[PDB]
Structure formats: structure tokens, C-alpha cells
Amino acid sequence: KVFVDANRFDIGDLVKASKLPQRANEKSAHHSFKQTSRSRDETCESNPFPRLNNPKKLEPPKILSQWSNTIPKTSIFYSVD
Amino acid sequence: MDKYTALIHDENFSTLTLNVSRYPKSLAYWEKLLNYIVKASAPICKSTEPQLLKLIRCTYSSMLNEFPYLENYYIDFALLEYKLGNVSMSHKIFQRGLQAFNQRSLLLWTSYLKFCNNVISHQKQLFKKYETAEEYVGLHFFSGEFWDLYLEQISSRCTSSKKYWNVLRKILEIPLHSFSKFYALWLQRIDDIMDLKQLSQLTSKDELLKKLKIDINYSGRKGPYLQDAKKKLKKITKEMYMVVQYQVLEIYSIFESKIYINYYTSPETLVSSDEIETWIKYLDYTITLQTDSLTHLNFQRALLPLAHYDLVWIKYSKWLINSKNDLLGAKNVLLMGLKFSLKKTEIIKLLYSVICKLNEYVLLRNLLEKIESSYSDNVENVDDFEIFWDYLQFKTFCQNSLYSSRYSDSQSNGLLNKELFDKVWKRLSCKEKKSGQEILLNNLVQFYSKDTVEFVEKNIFQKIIEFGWEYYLQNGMFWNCYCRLIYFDTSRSYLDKRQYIVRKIWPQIDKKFAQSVLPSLTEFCESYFPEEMDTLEEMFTEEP
Amino acid sequence: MNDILTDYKTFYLTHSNIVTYESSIIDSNTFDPILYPELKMSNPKYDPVDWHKKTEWKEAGHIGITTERPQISNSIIECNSGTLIQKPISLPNFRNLEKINQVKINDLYTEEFLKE
Amino acid sequence: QSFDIWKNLDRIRSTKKNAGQFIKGSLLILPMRTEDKQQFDECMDELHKYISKDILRCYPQKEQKDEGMLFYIVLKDFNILDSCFVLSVLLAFQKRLWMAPSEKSYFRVPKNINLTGSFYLPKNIETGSSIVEVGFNVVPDFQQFQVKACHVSKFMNELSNFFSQVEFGKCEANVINYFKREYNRTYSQISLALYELPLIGDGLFDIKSYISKTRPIIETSKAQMIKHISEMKAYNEIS
Amino acid sequence: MRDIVFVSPQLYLSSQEGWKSDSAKSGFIPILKNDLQRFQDSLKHIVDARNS
Amino acid sequence: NNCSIFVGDLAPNVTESQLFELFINRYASTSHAKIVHDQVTGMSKGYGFVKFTNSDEQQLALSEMQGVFLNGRAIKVGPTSGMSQFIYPVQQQPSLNHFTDPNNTTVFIGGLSSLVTEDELRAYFQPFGTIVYVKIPVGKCCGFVQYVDRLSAEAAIAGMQGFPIANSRVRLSWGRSAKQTALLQQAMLSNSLQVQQQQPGLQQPNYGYIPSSTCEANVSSTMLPGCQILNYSNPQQVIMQGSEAVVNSTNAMLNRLEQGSNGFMFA
Numbered sequence A: 001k002v003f004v005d006a007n008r009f010d011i012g013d014l015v016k017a018s019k020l021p022q023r024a025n026e027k028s029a030h031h032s033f034k035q036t037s038r039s040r041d042e043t044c045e046s047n048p049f050p051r052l053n054n055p056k057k058l059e060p061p062k063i064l065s066q067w068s069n070t071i072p073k074t075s076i077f078y079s080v081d
Numbered sequence B: 001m002d003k004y005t006a007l008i009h010d011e012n013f014s015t016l017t018l019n020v021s022r023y024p025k026s027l028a029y030w031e032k033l034l035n036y037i038v039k040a041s042a043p044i045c046k047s048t049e050p051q052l053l054k055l056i057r058c059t060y061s062s063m064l065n066e067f068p069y070l071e072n073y074y075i076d077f078a079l080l081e082y083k084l085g086n087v088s089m090s091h092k093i094f095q096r097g098l099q100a101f102n103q104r105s106l107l108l109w110t111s112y113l114k115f116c117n118n119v120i121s122h123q124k125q126l127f128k129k130y131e132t133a134e135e136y137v138g139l140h141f142f143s144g145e146f147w148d149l150y151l152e153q154i155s156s157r158c159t160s161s162k163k164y165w166n167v168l169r170k171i172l173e174i175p176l177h178s179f180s181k182f183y184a185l186w187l188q189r190i191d192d193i194m195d196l197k198q199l200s201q202l203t204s205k206d207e208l209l210k211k212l213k214i215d216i217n218y219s220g221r222k223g224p225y226l227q228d229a230k231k232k233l234k235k236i237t238k239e240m241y242m243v244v245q246y247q248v249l250e251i252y253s254i255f256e257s258k259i260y261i262n263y264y265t266s267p268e269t270l271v272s273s274d275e276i277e278t279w280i281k282y283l284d285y286t287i288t289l290q291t292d293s294l295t296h297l298n299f300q301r302a303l304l305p306l307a308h309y310d311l312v313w314i315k316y317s318k319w320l321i322n323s324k325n326d327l328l329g330a331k332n333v334l335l336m337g338l339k340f341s342l343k344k345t346e347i348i349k350l351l352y353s354v355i356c357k358l359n360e361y362v363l364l365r366n367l368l369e370k371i372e373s374s375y376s377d378n379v380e381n382v383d384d385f386e387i388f389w390d391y392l393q394f395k396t397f398c399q400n401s402l403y404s405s406r407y408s409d410s411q412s413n414g415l416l417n418k419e420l421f422d423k424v425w426k427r428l429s430c431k432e433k434k435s436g437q438e439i440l441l442n443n444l445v446q447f448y449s450k451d452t453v454e455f456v457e458k459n460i461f462q463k464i465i466e467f468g469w470e471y472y473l474q475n476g477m478f479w480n481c482y483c484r485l486i487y488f489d490t491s492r493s494y495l496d497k498r499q500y501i502v503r504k505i506w507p508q509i510d511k512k513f514a515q516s517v518l519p520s521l522t523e524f525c526e527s528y529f530p531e532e533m534d535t536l537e538e539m540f541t542e543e544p
Numbered sequence C: 001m002n003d004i005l006t007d008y009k010t011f012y013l014t015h016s017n018i019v020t021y022e023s024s025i026i027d028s029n030t031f032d033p034i035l036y037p038e039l040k041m042s043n044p045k046y047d048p049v050d051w052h053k054k055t056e057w058k059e060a061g062h063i064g065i066t067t068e069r070p071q072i073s074n075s076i077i078e079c080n081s082g083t084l085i086q087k088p089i090s091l092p093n094f095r096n097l098e099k100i101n102q103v104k105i106n107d108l109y110t111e112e113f114l115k116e
Numbered sequence D: 001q002s003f004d005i006w007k008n009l010d011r012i013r014s015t016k017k018n019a020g021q022f023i024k025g026s027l028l029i030l031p032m033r034t035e036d037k038q039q040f041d042e043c044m045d046e047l048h049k050y051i052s053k054d055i056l057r058c059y060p061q062k063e064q065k066d067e068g069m070l071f072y073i074v075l076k077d078f079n080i081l082d083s084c085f086v087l088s089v090l091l092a093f094q095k096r097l098w099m100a101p102s103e104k105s106y107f108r109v110p111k112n113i114n115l116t117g118s119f120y121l122p123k124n125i126e127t128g129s130s131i132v133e134v135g136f137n138v139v140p141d142f143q144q145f146q147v148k149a150c151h152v153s154k155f156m157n158e159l160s161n162f163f164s165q166v167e168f169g170k171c172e173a174n175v176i177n178y179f180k181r182e183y184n185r186t187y188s189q190i191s192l193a194l195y196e197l198p199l200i201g202d203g204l205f206d207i208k209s210y211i212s213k214t215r216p217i218i219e220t221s222k223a224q225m226i227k228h229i230s231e232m233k234a235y236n237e238i239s
Numbered sequence E: 001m002r003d004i005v006f007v008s009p010q011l012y013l014s015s016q017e018g019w020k021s022d023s024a025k026s027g028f029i030p031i032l033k034n035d036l037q038r039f040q041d042s043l044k045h046i047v048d049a050r051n052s
Numbered sequence F: 001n002n003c004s005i006f007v008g009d010l011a012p013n014v015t016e017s018q019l020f021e022l023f024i025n026r027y028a029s030t031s032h033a034k035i036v037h038d039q040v041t042g043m044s045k046g047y048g049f050v051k052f053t054n055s056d057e058q059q060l061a062l063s064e065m066q067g068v069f070l071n072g073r074a075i076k077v078g079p080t081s082g083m084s085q086f087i088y089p090v091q092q093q094p095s096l097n098h099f100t101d102p103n104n105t106t107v108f109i110g111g112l113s114s115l116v117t118e119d120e121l122r123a124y125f126q127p128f129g130t131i132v133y134v135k136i137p138v139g140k141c142c143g144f145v146q147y148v149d150r151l152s153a154e155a156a157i158a159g160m161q162g163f164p165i166a167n168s169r170v171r172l173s174w175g176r177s178a179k180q181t182a183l184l185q186q187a188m189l190s191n192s193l194q195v196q197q198q199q200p201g202l203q204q205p206n207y208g209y210i211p212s213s214t215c216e217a218n219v220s221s222t223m224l225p226g227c228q229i230l231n232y233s234n235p236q237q238v239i240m241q242g243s244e245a246v247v248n249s250t251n252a253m254l255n256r257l258e259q260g261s262n263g264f265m266f267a
Helices: A011-018 A025-030 A067-070 B003-008 B010-020 B027-040 B050-066 B073-085 B087-099 B106-119 B123-137 B143-157 B163-171 B182-189 B196-201 B205-212 B224-257 B271-288 B292-309 B311-323 B325-337 B344-356 B361-374 B383-400 B421-428 B437-443 B451-467 B469-472 B477-487 B494-504 B518-528 B533-539 C002-012 C018-024 C108-114 D005-014 D037-052 D081-098 D152-163 D175-195 D207-213 D215-236 E036-040 E046-052 F016-024 F053-064 F117-126 F150-160 F178-188 F248-263
Strands: D027-033 D056-059 D071-076 D115-121 D131-133 D143-150 E005-007 E030-031 F003-007 F030-037 F042-053 F104-108 F130-131 F142-147 F169-175 F230-232 F236-238
Touching: A011 E046, A067 B224, A067 B533, A067 F016, B003 B027, B003 B050, B003 F104, B010 B027, B010 E030, B010 E036, B027 B050, B050 B073, B050 B087, B050 E030, B073 B087, B073 B106, B087 B106, B106 B143, B123 B143, B123 B292, B123 E030, B143 B182, B163 F016, B182 B224, B196 B224, B224 B271, B271 B292, B271 B311, B292 B311, B311 B325, B311 B344, B311 B383, B325 B344, B325 D143, B344 B361, B344 B383, B361 B383, B361 D175, B383 F248, B421 B451, B437 B477, B437 F248, B451 B477, B451 B494, B451 E036, B477 B494, B477 B518, B518 F248, C002 D152, C018 D081, C108 F169, C108 F178, D005 D081, D005 D152, D027 D081, D027 D175, D037 D056, D037 D081, D056 D175, D071 D081, D071 D152, D071 D175, D081 D115, D081 D152, D131 D152, D143 D152, D207 D215, D215 F178, D215 F236, E005 E036, E036 E046, E036 F104, F003 F016, F003 F053, F016 F042, F042 F053, F104 F150, F130 F142, F142 F150, F150 F169, F169 F248
Parallel strands: none
Antiparallel strands: D027 D071, D027 D115, D056 D071, D115 D143, D131 D143, E005 E030, F003 F042, F030 F042, F104 F142, F104 F169, F230 F236
């Protein structure tokens, strides 16, 4: 209802208005991946347990590559894989 | 007919509304009903019926009053009211949303400030609102979007080019998750310097003259002078970068790489045993830093996923008690813990002691009135004994507070009050349905007087002997408590009470019922009556 | 100790009044017999009433292993920007920047049990 | 010093360096609770005979609980002495009902009692000890302030040192009714939360779907726990 | 509003006054007026377990 | 190393088995291979990933498959992984001792006076969490307290530190189990490797369990999240958390006070 950026209330009509309707057939036949358009009607009954449906591990805090040589090379805990 | 009349007479709307109002704490029913109401208005505009818009506003208000921890739906209804024309109602919805988390929710501050970047029409009020968000929520770990937005607003609105340096210098000491973008902005803004006189935008001139041994007004060849300035400031920034990098790397690699859920799902959800444990570990780390805004922020962040598990409520209440000596804060924590937690035993038991330390006992009586009226004066037939016993201790304390003593030796009447003994006897008459039977029998024998022990032995124990109920005659712990009542008298001698217990109790109990009494009476006889062991053995022997 | 404190919370709330209770409250050790038996359940030691050099700042994020983490002395993370704009902020004072890789472990298991 | 209110009032009038001027735009709200009304009425009539109507106002409840009343005491445009006097009298009276039912003096404070209370102030304060602020207040607009375990003279000195440093100003006109509505709303919410306490099991949680939603999951978690116990037993076995 | 009634089970299953209303009070669920008997007939077993 | 190669522009009649046969067993050993198909249609999009163990074999396969005939078209098996400022942090390992293991939940206790028993030492460490064994070495004035939770070990070390047991101050640290100590003694007598093993996990996620929760004692459980669902028994099995737990614990502590006032147990 907020983060999908297409079911947004104030600026969702601007997203739904100019689709760039791809009057070229090659622009529609180029991409062959899924759209994954999340509708507004998705409720809490779908995906009840967020850990069984496989999540992603969060990204680490990125550091500057010019100052990457001063990282602590020894970690606190043993991390596997 | 319009869409509102067709919405009333529709068959699905009544069924969805009754399934919502049948189980109000099922959030999926609320979301299906809300999506059906929004689907009923496929054009959403200001030209629709206000008789349906009032129903939409009442539905959102009921959903946000039933579930105030939903972060996205305050944003949804606030931008809905912004779509419907007005912004004062949207500001009221944002204010009650930020009050629902008590000013410590990052997403609502971020969405409210992205809203306020267009609607405020005033610069000083925007700066006061962003500084309020800075002093309350500005120490959040994942607040990169908030500080990126605030630096963007400073770089777009301010023309003096001084407040940006101040805020970015503050950010270079805060342990943020996305922190290296701010260091990269700092390093490319040091590169974007034009002369030496802008070094007063960083610090004062005496701190440059003392710590870095550099002058602003040093005139001459300022090329290598400014290059040495850049090198020394880059070295100081590199040292502070190592400090903040070690802090953020420690917090991530120990704590933040384990928590996968940071949002409020539902009161019906389940959170894994890893995440609860890592929230407790992260808050134990957070208490040690002794930064108060960050500590209250991280406790609110831990109240975000799992406020129904009641552990972080009691932990944050105990932290406000012992570490700060701010106990009204813990009282408000335990008051708001009643509104969300499902296991309301330990929070109310701690809140009793919190109220009793404050010496506000009319508030304690008004609180206990809500428990004794929540059952409609039927607290003796409750399944959970932990509620009734924690009620009964402090209700006995209040009855000792109001009424004076009846017995001698300055002994005030405890559980044997006219408003208390009937509630105990109403529970003891069930004998198989209500647990905590022997707890009262061990706690009604804690008076130790001459007339009060006689009073207790006359009201219940002689009455159990007179009726002859099967459950108390079968259990030997009942007779153990009855013998402990007489044997610890403070007025009788040893020989008279010993003759009493041996002669006029042990022949009274049944011989065929002694199979469950003898494992409980043998311990008492080995405890206090050593020479009376073989006498009791010859009474309960295998042959007549 | 938990059994004694729970039995005292059972007995004291049923055999005392506010007149005895309010005279027993002292401010030298914040002693209150209703709430003090609850806080003393978790830890056996409990005091009633220089932080960076103690034994709690060092093993905060991880127990057993001690370390001296680097910090900033004149930290401005608590002061709002409405007060930091009043005067230019001084240089950051540094400490413990020579132990960013050095960590020590009080290894008792090898020294007292393996190597005797 | 002594245990009398008026001697400490004379002392706090003497050596507080021209403390006769009141505070511009000053407001204080003390919500209190009494078991009975008839004992409260004589002390409040004596207080209105001592303190004027324009400075202090009183607000009753709606009698919804019928056992525990809730009375607002609003001190508006008050001086520093009348605030100390009113707070000393009310903090003595709302604890004398539990400690000393036989003393029978509404303006003489005994030695066995310690003053401990909680009073609200508006948010627009500027302070630039026994009275402390609170963290995580329950009121959206107002700030709760705590005093704990003091004698009479310490209460006088601490309240005067608190009001000599704080700076009030620009209060809203009908903020009293706003605080009344918000206070009633918050405590009606927690009373409804206590009303939700017997309705946990089978009442309003949709148990018929919640059993079937978690029936394989708890079984698989129990199988994981049994596998964890067996793997721990294999890990601790010497063999 | 016509053809509406505001009701919450938190004040009805606890058997308190003011459990139903016709005006927009904060914290109540709006249901239809003709289905209030269907709401009262649905929570019969909880009231029967509360009385017994 | 796990070098990854991205094959692209494949034909429609090429499944994962044909890609695994063309990638593995040809002068290399591909560890994994997966063709990225559609989300709802099931057809392949023409792209696939192949992750091998060695980087040299994957580089040789990418150099040999550059332009090979793959189901009538090209293979395009060039590598996918392997001047920006932002790079992910990389770390080494602490070589897995018994201090730097986050799953290490057993506490080594020392400094005893060789006088405390096993049931009494159980009674010291009982309310901090559920426990499995309290056995101690004889004549060594030390012991081992293994919990199930790591937060329970944190609470035990944070509370029990500096607590004198029988007029003798305690020393709390970490340590391995008895079998791992015997393996370390057997590997240290010859001094060949002296390598340790990590303690096994919990096979997370675990929705029912609540950490730092103890229970000593039909069951009609509603499995509500505010209460407790499952728990570890006190020796050991898995028990469903009933409602009459605080009642049984209260009866047990009253029985413990009654049997400790006389001297039937010292714990």
C-alpha cells in the first residue's frame, strides 16, 4: 500500500497514467522476465510466517575501498559460510 | 442507486463486516474488509459520496485504534486524507501515528518529513520539526534515508553553507548502518574546498591553532599549506572512521546480522527463538552505552516486532527502575504493556509493586477494582490461579490497610476477613477444577497465635472434618499443613500439642486413605516427631 | 534465594500494613520490601546505587572476552543541532586507537584445567 | 527544620531573594484520587479559603467507576509560594488517609510521612536533586515530574529550586479540557485492556483458523527440538 | 450516518454500558443496523461461558 | 572458491540436466548448476548459473565453451563474478576456539573448594535457564554447566561472577564438553593438530520456544504467542507448555522450603 509505488494514493495515478505504452514490438519482446506486480489486495493471510518463506540476509555496511586496509581482520565470533 | 447503497445491500460486505466484528484481533479480516471497501470505490476522488468517505474514515480509525502498532497504515490513511484535499486532518493522523509509538518510529518520521517537505510553506518550522526528529529518532541505526533527506533539504534551502558542515560533522560520529556515504560526501567536500578561510566552517580558529597547529590568516604560498591541511584533516577523519567502523562492524557482525524482522506483523504472528534472543542481547549491549535517546530508541525498536511477548516491556521497566531511578517511567511502561501483551500475569504483578513503591494506594484500589469488575465479582472461578493469587496478596494488603487489628500482639487480620475468607472458600469448594489448592493451605497457616490458629482450625479444617470431602481427606499435604498449623504455636508447650497431634488427629484419618497420606505424613513425622515414628507405624501396619 | 524472596512477597503482603511499610523506606539504599524482592530474583549480587574502564563496557557486545573499544571523548551524538549551531565544535578527542586489532582473552580453561 | 507548613512558608518567603513575583503564562495540573469525598471537602474548603479562585481551580470526574474518584487541581498563574503550599497540603492529605487516620489536622504534617508525588506541567519549559523528569511519558502534550521521599523543608526547598530555574510561557486556553479528554481516553483504553483479560482463550482470536495455521509448524519445531536433544546427546557422549 | 451502528465486543462481552452507539466514537467497529441480531446471536457461547 | 559462470542465450529445449552434463564431467567438476526459468510460466529465459569449486577449472570451462554448440546456438559461458568506493567488508576467522564460538553455551566454572555437590551446583544455576547436566570432575575443583540457550549463559556469567561458593570466590569462563576435552587431551599429548569442533546449532527458525524460560513439571493448548508453546524438560524430552505451570512451580518451591527447613536436601 505504500512501498509498491503503484498502489500509492497521491502519486499512483501518475504511475498508472504514463506507462510508456511501448508501441514498438521489440520493446515488448525484448524483456522475457516476470513483472512481479504486487497488487493492493494482498493481505496478512498470505505469507503468515516470514522465516519459512526464504528471506534474504541483509547487506553488510559498505566501507570505503581506499580505507579498507584498516578493517579488524579478526572477527569476534566464528561465522560459517 | 449510488455505490454506497449498493455497498449496503451487497451480500459480501455484511459477511466480511461480521467476520471482522466477530474476531476483532484477526488482522487479515481487517485487511480483507479494507481492501473490499477500497475496491468498492474504484475511482477514488473528492466527487464521491461523503456518506461512504465517513465510513472509510471510521474503518481506518477503528483499525488504527485496535492495532496502533501498524506503521504503514498511518501513512496510508494520511496520504488518503492528503488525496482527499485537506492536510490538517493528515497532520492529525501523522501526530497520532507518531504518538502511537511515542515519537520513536523511524518510518513514520521519514514519511511525515517527506510529506512535510512540500506542505509546510515555512522554513523555520521545517527546521524545528527536523531538529525534533533529530533529537528523538535521529540516532537510529538504519536512518540513512532520514539523514540523506535532511542533508538534501539543508543543501537545497540553506545558502550560507554552514549548517551542512555542522550536521555532517555530527553524522561522522554517529554509528549508522549506511555510514560510508556520509564519509564519502565529507571526503569529496574536503576536495571541494576553495581557500583556507573555509576551514573556519569546520572548527574554530583556536582549535586549529592548538590541535593542528595551523592558522587561517597565514599568508604566503598557500598551496602546500592547504595540501597539508587536507592531509591532516584526512588523517583525523580516517581515525574517526576507524572508530565508527569498528563500532558499526561490531554491532552488525554480532547483533544486526541476526535479526531478520523489524516490523509489526500482527498479534497472531510468531517470532523465532533466535530473534528474541538477539533482541535481548542487543538491548543488553544498548544499556551499556548509556546514551539515553539511542537506548529508548532501541527499546522502542524492540517493542516494534514483539510487543506481545512481554519480555522487552518488563526488561525496559526494570531498566527504568534500577539504572535510572526513574520509576514513573516504568509505571507508564507497565501501563502501556497492559494494552498489548497477552500474558498479563507478570506485568500486572510487577505493576503492583511499582504502584506500591509510589505510595499511591487509591490508584492501587482503583486498579484492583478493574480486575474484580472484569470478572463481574467471580474471581474465585478463574482458570488461571496466577491472576487470582497476585490479586489476593495485594487485596489482603489493602484490607490490612483499611481495617484495624482484631487479635492481640499487634497482629492484623490477614486472609480471614469477611471480604476475603468467602473468596477463598468459594475457590476451595471445587476440589478438582481450580488449581492452587495447597498453596492457600500452606498460606492460611502463617499466623502463629493462640486464638488465630484456633480460628483457622475452626473455620476450614474442622469444617473439612465435619463434611468429610474426598479430595482433602485423600491428600496428605492437607493434613501436613494442619499439623504444621498446630505444631508451630507460640503459646502452647511441647507435650500438650504433641499429645494433641498424636491422640486426636492420627486416629481420625482413614486407614484405607493413608496410601497417599503416608508419603506426605512420613516426612513430617521424620521431621519433627522422632519417637512417634514406631507408634504411627503400628497404626498403619499391614495387618489388623 | 528466589524461594526466600517469593515467600517473603507472599507473607509480607498478607501480614503488614502501610503504617509499618512507610516507616521502613530509607533513601540510603532505596530499600522497599514490595519491589526489591522482585529485582533481586535474577542476579545474586545487587547494588542499590570512569565507565569506560570498568568490567561492563569492555565485555558489552560479547561476554567472556574483554576488549578496549575505541570511542570519542567529546561525543556530540546527544546534543541537538539547534545547540551545536551556536558555536563551532572543537576537534574530536581520540582514545584507544592503538587497540583496533588487539584483543585479549582471560583463558582460564587452558591454564587451570588443561595445563593444570 | 520543623514539621509545620507555615514556618517553612515563612522561611521560603524570607530567603528566596524577592520570590513574590509570579510566572507569566504558568500552569500546573495535579490529578489526584481519593477513596471518600466528605473528608476531602473540608480540606478543599479550607484551601479555597486560603487560596483564591482565580489562581487555583478544581475539576471533578463523571463518576464512571463509582468507587475511585479522580479530581483535577489546576494551578494557573501561580506564585512560587502558593504552589509549594498547595502541593504540600495535597501531598500530605492524599497519604494521611492511609498513614494517619487519627491525627485529624489538615495543615500539620507529621514526621513519619515522606512526600512522594507526581505532577504534570506543559511541554514549553526551559530549565536553563529530588524532583526528576520522566522518560516515556503517557501524555502526548504534557511532561510528568516526580518527587520522592522528602521531609517538609526539603520539599519546600526542592520545589522552590525547581520553579526558580524553569521558565514557562504561552499556554493554550482550553488545554485543561484537552488534558481531561486525553486522560480519560488513555485510562479508558487501559480499562478496556483489562476488560480484554478474560477474553484471551477462545474469545476473539479466531482460534478455529489459528490451530490449523500452526498445526504442522509446532510439530516440525518439536521434531527439530527432539533432533537437537539427540544431537546434543551424541555430542556429549564419549563412547 | 444512516444504516450503520457502532459496536465493539470488548464492551459487550464484558457486559458494560455504552457497548453500542450510532455516532462515530473512536474504537468501535461499524456494522449494519439490520445485522445487529446476527452479531448478538454469534457471541452466544462466550456469554454463556461467562455467566456459567 | 566457488567460481560462478553465467551461460546465456540458450535454446528452449535445454533443461538443467543437459547444462549439468555439458558443464560438469568435462575436465572439471561443477558443484551446482541452475537455469533461471520464468516465475509462473516454467519456460527457461535462456540464462543459467554454474558454480564450481575451483576457479582454474571454471576458467578453463569458460575458455573452452566460448562459442561451443549448445542445443543449436552459442553457449556464451563467460564469467559473471570475478572503480567504486563501496565494497563489502571481508574478514578472517578466529580459528574456532571455545571463546569465539557463538553457539558455545557451556560455562566452565572453577575456583571451587572441592566441597559443593552436583545437586547444589544445579541449584545455583537452575533459574537462569534450562539445563542438561551438572557433572563435575573429581579432585580438580572445577566443573561444567551446559545450558541450551546462549542468553541464559550470558545471564549466568553476568550474575554469578564474583559470587563466593562456600567461602571461595568463583572463576567463570568458557570451555568445551567432556568428550571434546578428552579429544583435546588425546591430541595434545602427541601435539599433532589439537583442533576443536563447533557446537551444533538449533536448526533455526524455532517459533514455539521462548529463551530463558524454565518449567519443572491432558494439555489443551491454544498455542498463543503471548504465552509459551514448547519447552525443554528438566532431567530429558520436549514438553508442551501447559497453563498450570506457575501453580506446580509454587507447590514445588513450597515443598522445597518444607524439605529444606528440616534437612532432607541441601540444594
